[PDB]
Design a protein around this nucleic acid. Structure first.
Lengths: 53, 141, 52, 137, 127, 75, 191
RNA sequence: AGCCACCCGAGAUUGAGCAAUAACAGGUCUGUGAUGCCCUUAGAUGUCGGGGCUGCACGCGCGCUACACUGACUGGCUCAGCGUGUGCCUACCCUACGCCGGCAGGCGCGGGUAACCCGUUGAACCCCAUUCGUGAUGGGGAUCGGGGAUUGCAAUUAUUCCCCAUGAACGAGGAAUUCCCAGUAAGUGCGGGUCAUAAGCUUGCGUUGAUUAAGUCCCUGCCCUUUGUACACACCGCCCGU
């Protein structure tokens, strides 16, 4: 008997999350990545990012 | 010559006086109580400076292929005091800069031309050169 | 560092995308045809009708 | 090397050479540096001079323009209180009369029991910003 | 217990509009005049999806005589700006854990409900 | 630190003093004149600008921040 | 110009070094004459390099100290050029000759280095290198000029000029002289 | 083996990336539909409405803004670089250019997934002619009052921005203590990240640019032999008597 169970969000960090988990703070929205930094560390190999400097 | 060969400070002052002789500068109903830019902590000393700015703008446009409000605002702009936060660049009053561009256009010092905004008029090219000659004899610094 | 105590350690990854263009002038199809064949993986190649 | 003109009154303070005219005036409340500078420009008085220079004439001309600001084209935005809360106009408030209104507004919002009023009265910081380890020593 | 000449002596303008004129304008004509915080709320809100709350205000004002205040009408919102329609009601203004009951008098108009309810002590350390 | 002020009124006696003390100087700046008299520093400066239309003082700098005057040609 | 390279409105000629022990760290024409001082803006590249830098250039560099005034050479060059003019009016002469004399008179001879002696406060009398004597002198004089200017009407240019002239022939109104007399006196004493 | 100087000159003078053997109950179950056991689970600890993290008699740390004249003020001169952008898989751009407004801001166009357009990135420091005159002064912008706007459906407990007024301590910092050898310290702006709105943050970048060791093991830390040890959970250990 649902009547409300969503509320509009498009505001702050609370309107988005990682695409494998739910997380807040440090969400990379640049380049359409949409992953939290902690997850991005483990997948930084798979995107093609590399450290030389 | 280009205007750059002669003394730049003397050029703008000489041109500013030449503008006063013309007898019109299509002056604002502001500039007697103004904040002006937000880089200012004190209201302008006089209402004289409008001529000086106009001369400066005319010179700046002479250099370029055509430009409008944006170019003038950055040059006149400086450091903006943000209170107790770090001082940073900004761009101040746009009403005055726009008004100056309109007023110069009215006298036909500068006119709309290609590459957007106003570029110099041959009437202005002649005027600038005459004061350039006076300046050229005076010094070079 | 996950969970920030210790020292300030920062990691910076770069990714260097490289672009080049080449403007060929010669007739219609036989250009884009002879070029785009003989390659399949791993380097994007775009042939554009742009430029008159 | 002209003495001669000295000792001018703006409102309840003695104004003498010390600084440029504009700055000299700002002893009184309700006249900041910008206010006094713009009043002088309106009143056609060179503001680079001293307040031990200039006669009584110039002072009165300044006083009339400050206390009738609209009627001499000092705009409404430039005013300390715009539309006010007591008075339906737009008033420049000067001297001791600013202190009056400040008191009024604080009492006012203690009655009405508005957040600004209550915080100020109790000694808590009216702005919502940190006072965690600040607002003291 | 409602409207002007009654719980007021500070009077004059709130902000540009005298309480006389205010109380006999509608909120429509109020936001047009001198009102900037209120004006943003009403324009962007656009009657502001607090519908039922506002109707509960009118309801208990109606059913109570105009000689006395309502039966008290609670709300969870406290971002509500007092509009002349409301005035004379008695509003339970939630604080997320307490409803402070506040009669809305003619001096409160243009101010927020929230400013008359507290989440905060006078602050002590044994003081 | 410190507290030091000068007369900020343009006076009679100090202008006269200045012009009649003139062989003492060979270096003249606003600050010097200010110290040696009680004239302001600002109105030190201005007194010099007046003085230069006797030409008992000659310009040898004209810098924005502060100016340097000589007394006569070289003294 | 190639015959003699002058300063930018003063001469490099008639500058005499009035000491035989301070030679080869005082120069202005022994190759090192410049209209405008600036080498390349490094002086810490070699230990050799210090000899290259003349006393005039070293004095401009040492001046820019205390956070706001740091890293503004252009301001200092303008102040210094003004300072030379102030010296010239006050004593005639050549301002560079006044500068050289000031360095020689302000430079210490003996100083002290720490030496252990029971844990009591004693020190060993030692002579110091002429490079050190020049370096310390220039420091003292710049710090003196800045110190005066801070809460007084006079500008850095004026105070620097006053500081050099007083040191050039003693007056006991120069900071550098007063400090030097303390260092040499203490040196003589000790253990 | 190597060391020192000298020539050429980027000099045997750049900065990152890089980690062994092994230790640590360092931090993390709140990055993880990695996970053991436990709790709770339709009566939720699985979702919406509201408030607090933002409360201050006081202690601490990283900072920021300051204490001025290489500056406050009013005109004017004038040179950049690393990077970035819309038309995106849960939400969206940079703006030249026209007009209006002191300002905040409002409004019309057009180009550009881009060394095409923003951006000849004509930035700040700097340079210059004044004013002010070292005076808590106009240095400083604290606190407060009134008003305008921008962001959001919602700003109350200022989200932020602007306009005016009100115009604090602080005029160089004790006990103590950090960092630094060259485009370095210090001054100074800029771009990106967080993001509906919101930087005093951090990551890079160019600009202006020193004084000073030019060495050594004194203190401190770490690493070499030797020696001593009642130590071995290893001296923040042990270890005695009243």
């Amino acid at each position: 008997q649902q009547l409300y169970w969503s509320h509009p969000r498009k505001f702050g960090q609370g309107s988005r999350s990682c695409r494998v988990c739910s997380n807040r703070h440090g969400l990379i929205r640049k380049y359409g990545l949409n992953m939290c930094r902690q997850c991005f560390r483990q997948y930084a190999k798979d995107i093609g990012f590399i450290k030389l400097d | 010559v280009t205007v750059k060969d002669v003394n730049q400070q003397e050029f703008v002052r000489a041109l500013a006086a030449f503008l006063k002789k013309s007898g019109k500068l299509k002056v604002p109903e502001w500039v007697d109580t103004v904040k002006l830019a937000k880089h200012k902590e004190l209201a302008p000393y006089d209402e004289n400076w409008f001529y000086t700015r106009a001369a400066s703008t005319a010179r700046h446009l002479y250099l370029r292929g055509g430009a409008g409000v944006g170019s003038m605002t950055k040059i006149y702009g400086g450091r903006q005091r943000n209170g107790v936060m770090p001082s940073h660049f900004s761009r101040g009053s746009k009403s005055v800069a726009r008004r100056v561009l309109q007023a110069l256009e009215g006298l036909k010092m500068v006119e709309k031309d290609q590459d957007w905004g106003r570029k110099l008029t041959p009437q202005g090219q002649r005027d600038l050169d005459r004061i350039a000659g006076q300046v050229a004899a005076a010094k070079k610094k | 560092t996950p969970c920030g105590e210790g020292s300030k350690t920062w990691d910076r990854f770069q990714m260097r995308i490289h672009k080049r263009l080449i403007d060929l002038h010669s007739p219609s199809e036989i250009v884009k045809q002879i070029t785009s064949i003989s390659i399949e993986p791993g380097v994007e190649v775009e042939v554009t009708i742009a430029d008159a | 090397p002209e003495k001669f003109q000295h000792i001018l009154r703006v409102l309840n303070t003695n104004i003498d050479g010390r600084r440029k005219i504009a700055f000299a005036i700002t002893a009184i409340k309700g006249v900041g540096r910008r206010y006094a500078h713009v009043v002088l420009r309106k009143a056609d008085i060179d503001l680079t001079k001293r307040a031990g220079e200039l006669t009584e004439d110039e002072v009165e001309r300044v006083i009339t323009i400050m206390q009738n600001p609209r009627q001499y084209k000092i705009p409404d935005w430039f005013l300390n209180r715009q539309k006010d809360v007591k008075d339906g106009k737009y008033s420049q408030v000067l001297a001791n009369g600013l202190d009056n209104k400040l008191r009024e507004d604080l009492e006012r919002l203690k009655k009405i029991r508005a957040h600004r009023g209550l915080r100020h009265f109790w000694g808590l910081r009216v702005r919502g910003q940190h006072t965690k380890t600040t607002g003291r020593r | 217990v409602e409207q002007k000449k009654k719980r007021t002596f500070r009077k004059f303008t709130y902000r540009g509009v005298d309480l006389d004129q205010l109380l006999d304008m509608s909120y429509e004509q109020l936001m047009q005049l001198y009102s900037a915080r209120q004006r943003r709320r009403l324009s962007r809100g656009l009657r502001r999806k607090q519908h039922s709350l506002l109707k509960r205000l009118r309801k208990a004002k109606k059913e109570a005589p105009p000689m006395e205040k309502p039966e008290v009408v609670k709300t969870h919102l406290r971002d509500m700006i007092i509009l002349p329609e409301m005035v004379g009601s008695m509003v339970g203004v939630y604080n997320g854990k307490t409803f402070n009951q506040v009669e809305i008098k003619p001096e409160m108009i243009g101010h927020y409900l929230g400013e008359f309810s507290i989440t905060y002590k006078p602050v002590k350390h044994g003081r | 630190r410190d507290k030091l002020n000068n007369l900020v009124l343009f006076d009679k006696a100090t202008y006269d003093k200045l012009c009649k003390e003139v062989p003492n100087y060979k270096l003249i700046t606003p600050a010097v004149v200010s110290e040696r008299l009680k004239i302001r520093g600002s109105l030190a400066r201005a007194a010099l600008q007046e003085l230069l239309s006797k030409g008992l003082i000659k310009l040898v700098s004209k810098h924005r921040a502060q100016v340097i005057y000589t007394r006569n040609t070289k003294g | 110009t190639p015959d003699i390279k002058l300063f930018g409105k003063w001469s490099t000629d008639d500058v005499q070094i009035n000491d035989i022990s301070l030679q080869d760290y005082i120069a202005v024409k022994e190759k090192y004459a410049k209209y405008l001082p600036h080498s390349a803006g490094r002086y810490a590249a070699k230990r050799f390099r210090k000899a290259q830098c003349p006393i005039v250039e070293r004095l401009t560099n040492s001046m820019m100290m205390h956070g706001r005034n740091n890293g503004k050479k252009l301001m200092t060059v303008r102040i210094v050029k003004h300072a030379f003019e102030i010296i010239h009016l006050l004593t005639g002469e050549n301002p560079l000759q006044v500068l050289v004399n000031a360095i020689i008179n302000s430079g210490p001879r003996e100083d002290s280095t720490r030496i252990g002696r029971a844990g009591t406060v004693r020190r060993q009398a030692v002579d110091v290198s002429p490079l050190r004597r020049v370096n310390q002198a220039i420091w003292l004089l710049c710090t003196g000029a800045r110190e005066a200017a801070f809460r007084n009407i006079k500008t850095i240019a004026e105070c620097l000029a006053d500081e050099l002239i007083n040191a050039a022939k003693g007056s006991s109104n120069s900071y550098a002289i007063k400090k030097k007399d303390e260092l040499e006196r203490v040196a003589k004493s000790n253990r």
